[PDB]
Amino acid sequence: AICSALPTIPYHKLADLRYLSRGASGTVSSARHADWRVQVAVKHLHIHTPLLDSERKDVLREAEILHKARFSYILPILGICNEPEFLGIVTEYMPNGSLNELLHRKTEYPDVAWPLRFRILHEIALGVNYLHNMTPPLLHHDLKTQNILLDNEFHVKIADFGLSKWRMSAPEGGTIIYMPPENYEPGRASIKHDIYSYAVITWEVLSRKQPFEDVTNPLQIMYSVSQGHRPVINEESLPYDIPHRARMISLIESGWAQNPDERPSFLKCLIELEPVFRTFEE
Amino acid sequence: ICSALPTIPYHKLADLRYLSRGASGTVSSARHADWRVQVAVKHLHIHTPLLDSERKDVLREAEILHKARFSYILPILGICNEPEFLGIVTEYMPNGSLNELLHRKTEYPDVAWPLRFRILHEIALGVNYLHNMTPPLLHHDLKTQNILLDNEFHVKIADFGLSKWRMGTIIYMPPENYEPSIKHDIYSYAVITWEVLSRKQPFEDVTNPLQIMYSVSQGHRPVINEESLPYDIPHRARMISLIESGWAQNPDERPSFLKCLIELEPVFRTFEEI
Ligand SMILES: Nc1ncnc2c1ncn2[C@@H]1O[C@H](COP(=O)(O)OP(=O)(O)CP(=O)(O)O)[C@@H](O)[C@H]1O
Ligand SMILES: Nc1ncnc2c1ncn2[C@@H]1O[C@H](COP(=O)(O)OP(=O)(O)CP(=O)(O)O)[C@@H](O)[C@H]1O
Ligand SMILES: [Co+2]
Ligand SMILES: [Mg+2]
Ligand SMILES: [Mg+2]
């Protein structure tokens, strides 16, 4: 049993802690590791409140998942900082933010060239396919453009394993826009959540649009999706000059199909799309 | 918190092609049939039956790579462990080795300074990480052929075949290793630094390795002059000073990698992003 231990990073080795992002459940900060001399990201529980023991278990579980799931397109975990009053997952620092920022910050990024977009889509599928091929399979359950991070040369690192589950009545978690309709309510199709999210991501990458942008109430989105409505496919959302437009639309519509049986495995998706990805030059 | 190294069944390796044969094994490219990625496979000779001592060497190397994972270390993806096949499966590095970058002058007429300095910085970060493990991992075979370059020319340190937990060419070896070794890696790094900044083969004109060994034991080192190291090398004086400490006759005069990074960080910092 060849084993790799996740390093424990003592608190005094984290220098220059700076707020990057605060959320509901925790905070992401940048830091430098004083000994390794690299920039890191630290995803930690709130510094304000005392540390709840159930919150501690959630962080340890996420850290273990990241550690086990390591692969070319998955955010590398560097260690865990586990202290009486501080608990943080230490990962590689991603200099180029998230796919969300790339797609929707149109002043910062006026042009996002097709080969880059297709490489991003290919790398996401490779990352998730890897997760689904683990024993037991790891299901991400929160794939979205905000959780696809971009390294120094805009290669994909899938992040945020907070809702992930090993496949071994309540529905799984997720973000509503990227969630298939069968996951909305209590009461086998669990494995087809990630591909649905990927289809919405693909639509979002090729359009540079917010899915369901005109729909102001998320409950209306949920009602419409449960009736089979999806982000709009027309000349306006998806211009005619998108490379391999017909094949990509066909794949999207299978990926987000109402019937989960009509959605491909990620392996199937890769087999179907490899000829498309291959047409692009380095 | 434990991570298991995957066992990759032989039937999942497709399109096996010879890349490089050495004395102890062979490196082949392949595709993983399920993961749909290109891989490199470092395996024992397909011709001979598999000696059990050779098997243990490969397993030991695989374990070291698995434990040593870090941003500047070659990622191991799994082990293929079969009755008649034994191979370490790693990420495929598209841009070869630092050796090829430096010495294939038709293929690479210009290697710009910011790239060279970034490479030197990343090597030191990789080795510093190894030396900071508990117990420390000593590489003991650092050379330009063992520094691999990924798709955007970032460093992955490879070849852990001679590595040791702290409980072939002699040009990168300090003299105390062959006098008739905690400071071995930094000595190799000093020679690598000279090689990166010069684009020259260390001791190129010395035809007998025994002459190299004798000369080094007497304090001779790769030549530092205007010809080997041009005056227009950024931070030339500081870099020469560092090199000469890194390969100092007395191992006590050679820095830790942490010390080397502390001393060189201001130099590395002057360069803009590529
Ligand atoms: N390694 C990393 N490098 C650089 N930035 C990172 C990073 N990890 C996270 N971030 C930034 O922090 C933000 C939140 O990270 P993440 O999604 O994992 O936290 P979280 O799970 O607590 C949000 P939520 O509670 O909504 O699920 C990311 O969108 C990104 O901007
Ligand atoms: N992941 C990888 N990706 C691409 N090429 C690789 C590679 N790993 C090794 N190579 C190539 O094979 C060559 C030899 O690899 P490596 O040094 O690890 O084997 P080895 O230890 O058997 C040689 P020696 O017997 O001299 O020690 C490398 O220099 C490189 O050209
Ligand atoms: Co498990
Ligand atoms: Mg989350
Ligand atoms: Mg070797």
Residue numbers in the entry:
A (entry chain B): 5 to 172, 183 to 201, 205 to 299
B (entry chain A): 6 to 172, 188 to 200, 207 to 300
How did the manuscript describe this experimental structure?
NOD1 and NOD2 (Nucleotide-binding oligomerization domain-containing proteins 1 and 2) are cytosolic receptors of the innate immune system, which respond to intracellular fragments of the bacterial peptidoglycans, D-glutamyl-meso-diaminopimelic acid (iE-DAP) and muramyl dipeptide (MPD), respectively. Upon ligand recognition, NOD receptors oligomerise and recruit an adaptor protein, Receptor Interacting protein kinase 2 (RIP2), through interactions of their respective CARD domains. RIP2 also contains an N-terminal dual-specificity ser/tyr kinase domain (RIP2K), which belongs to the TKL kinase family (Tyrosine kinase-like). RIP2 undergoes auto-phosphorylation and K-63 linked ubiquitination at Lys209, becoming a scaffolding protein for downstream effectors.
